[PDB]
Design a protein around this ligand. Structure first.
Ligand code: MET
Ligand SMILES: [Zn+2]
Ligand SMILES: [Zn+2]
Lengths: 150, 151
């Protein structure tokens, strides 16, 4: 399936979960992952904080994982979505996400790409909140979440 | 090291469709990523609830008009969406598909697909009225294929 029918009341955040896999015409695979920060419907990450997380993780995830096609916030704002070129590898993605979260928690330099030239809403950021969201996930501890279908 | 930061956001002219990048799998298949821009960078942003609804609506509507869709995701800057597609670059065809999907979005008077505590991580944070108007605004202004201007 390209997108499994997930029961959001059954998962246990924070986690890494293979959200789907698409086969390309030549036989390669694109794997999609649900990088869940918060428990579905128990709160959301503020828009400025998730915007900063996107800027930081776009770089940090790529520092720890090859084949990343996109790292983007989810509309529900409880986590990030990522598409990767490669066979499903939840364990490898979890370790990469963990390393990237440590980079994020300790990011005390200016936020990369924040300017009128490089960002579509450079006034809407929050490094302190992004760093703390990363710290909270690490404190809670990641796990590979199984997909529970509705 | 993030390609997104290399686009000169002061030079583009929203709304538009723009090929943001192309990657190839080990065997040679192309994965094209498109910048589907609703608002002019830094001149305002789409409300979180509205962009959340757009994500739900375009997920189905883009697939109805275009093959090989990987996903449609909202941008953190909330001025547009990113969409990866399995296939060679085709900005013109993607523009036509986005145009048809926006017509479907603007006229969407049925329930928002996938909205319930079971199917969505923040089911109360939606705004169909606002999403439909944003689709209507893009169509009113008119889409075009935007060339990438590098910094
Ligand atoms: C604006 S930070 C970059 C985010 C973009 N979705 C990426 O995959 O790099
Ligand atoms: Zn930005
Ligand atoms: Zn949702």
């Amino acid at each position: 399936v390209e997108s499994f029918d997930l029961d959001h009341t059954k998962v246990k955040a924070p986690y890494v979960r293979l959200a789907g896999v698409k086969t390309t015409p030549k036989g390669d695979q694109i794997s999609k992952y649900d990088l869940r920060f918060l428990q579905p419907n128990q709160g959301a990450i503020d828009p400025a904080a998730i915007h900063t997380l996107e800027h930081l993780l776009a770089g940090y995830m790529r520092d720890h994982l090859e084949g990343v096609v996109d790292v983007s916030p989810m509309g529900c704002r409880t986590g990030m979505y990522m598409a990767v070129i490669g066979e499903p590898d939840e364990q490898g993605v979890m370790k990469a996400f963990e390393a990237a979260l440590k980079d994020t928690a300790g990011h005390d330099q200016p936020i990369p790409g924040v300017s009128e030239l490089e960002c579509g809403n450079y006034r809407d950021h929050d490094l302190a909140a992004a760093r703390q969201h990363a710290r909270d996930v690490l404190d809670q501890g990641l796990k590979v979440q199984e997909t529970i279908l509705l």
